[PDB]
Amino acid sequence: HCAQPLALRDLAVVYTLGPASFLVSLASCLALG
């Protein structure tokens, strides 16, 4: 149990993952239309 509490590799992307997903969905909606 309890593999790792910290990860800088994933921390470099955790900040942008939400906006990344939202922008990808927005662009998909724009392109499919």
């Binding site: 955790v14 993952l17 939400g18 997903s21 939202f22 927005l26 724009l30």
Partner: protein, 392 residues
């Protein structure tokens, strides 16, 4: 303790004409596609609320991955569908600043990124996911699309109840999240373990001002928000509800239908129902010397009685009933069950400006009563002798 990352994800996330027309058509509730999409998103919001309810008993921070538990995967799928729905919403409208601050948009902004990070990364955190409760405000709306609700009053009442429940559950989730965690300045060692349902019970006690005190918020943040919640509740109760509650409390007094009882005959009295005429008619008809006491007098006048006539009816309540209506309207005749009435007595306005007009009115009342039920006895008062011939 990595709640900062899952909060900052949502925080950062929050911070062509032809396709716009297409999106506006699809999102519009006028089409069936938009109706079905709204129904699906409401059902998914209910599912997300149920997921939060189950996960409330779970520890707030625990490491998990998608393959470990299924409910995590269902919640992820719900978040993906919410993301698609939000994209459609935002691309639908011409102006974008409203969707930059829209309530459903901000709820999605605060609920999607935390799941999107918690699905794969460890330290799964029950963040601001209780905000899915706010989607019950739209509940009344779906009852409109499904044609179950057909009355404006009932729709308004359902909307009021939905908003009440949504605010209750949202604030309960807020209190649960603030109490289970500690004060950030206090190194999270001053937290109090509170069940979500215990938080709901606490909020119900506080809104009613019962204040039992068995359960209360002990953290500084929890108390500060309790003070903010009583402020908001008092303001909403003084502003949002009271006019509508008074609207719900409005009621007609004398509207209704006569409840007949077998073995007790009734006579229907109409015409000039006024304090003087009713007084005289009652002092003569209901004199204490009558052995015929089983007869009940039902009065039918379209004017609502004043306080003195109300008192007059009150004194003889055990024999006298009143209803607001006119014998000209067949529905009002049906209300007093005049088809089974022993007799109909018409009182005349003796002190009338034009006796002929009043006699004509009484004759036409006789015509109405006869048309509804020909085989009923009628005793009508006649001001002028020559007007009796019309009855022939």
């Amino acid at each position: 303790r990595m709640w900062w990352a899952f909060l900052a994800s949502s925080m950062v996330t929050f911070f062509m004409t032809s396709v716009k027309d297409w999106a506006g058509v699809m999102i519009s509730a006028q089409t069936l596609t938009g109706r079905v999409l709204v129904v699906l998103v409401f059902a998914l919001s209910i599912g997300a609320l149920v997921i939060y309810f189950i996960d409330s008993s779970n520890p707030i921070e625990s490491c998990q991955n998608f393959y470990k538990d299924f409910t995590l995967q269902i919640d992820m799928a719900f978040n993906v569908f919410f993301l698609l729905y939000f994209g459609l919403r935002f691309i639908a409208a011409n102006d974008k600043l409203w969707f930059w601050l829209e309530v459903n948009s901000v709820v999605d902004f605060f609920t999607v990124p935390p799941v999107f990070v918690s699905v794969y990364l460890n330290r799964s955190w029950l963040g601001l996911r209780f905000l899915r409760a706010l989607r019950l405000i739209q509940f009344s709306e779906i009852l409109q699309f499904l044609n179950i609700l057909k009355t404006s009053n009932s729709i308004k009442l359902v909307n009021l109840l939905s908003i009440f429940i949504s605010t209750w559950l949202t604030a309960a989730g807020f209190i649960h999240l603030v109490e289970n965690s500690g004060d950030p300045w206090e190194n999270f060692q001053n937290n109090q373990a509170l069940t979500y349902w215990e938080c709901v019970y606490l909020l119900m006690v506080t809104m009613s001002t019962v204040g039992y005190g068995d359960v209360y918020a002990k953290t500084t943040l929890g108390r500060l928000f309790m003070v903010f919640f009583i402020l908001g509740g008092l303001a909403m109760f003084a502003s949002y509800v009271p006019e509508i509650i008074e609207l719900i409390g409005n009621r007609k007094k004398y509207g209704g239908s006569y409840s007949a009882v077998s073995g007790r005959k009734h006579i229907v009295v109409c015409g000039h129902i006024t304090l003087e005429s009713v007084s005289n008619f009652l002092k003569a008809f209901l004199h204490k010397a009558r052995d015929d006491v089983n007869v009940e007098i039902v009065f039918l006048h379209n004017i609502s009685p004043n306080l003195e006539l109300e008192a007059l009816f009150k004194r003889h309540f055990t024999q006298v009933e009143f209803y607001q209506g006119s014998v000209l309207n067949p529905h009002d005749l049906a209300r007093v069950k005049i088809e089974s009435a022993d007799a109909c007595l018409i009182l005349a306005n003796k002190y009338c400006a034009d006796p002929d007009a009043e006699d004509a009115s009484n004759i036409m009342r006789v015509i109405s009563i006869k048309n509804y039920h020909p085989k009923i006895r009628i005793i009508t008062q006649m001001l002028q002798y020559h007007n009796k011939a019309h009855l022939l």
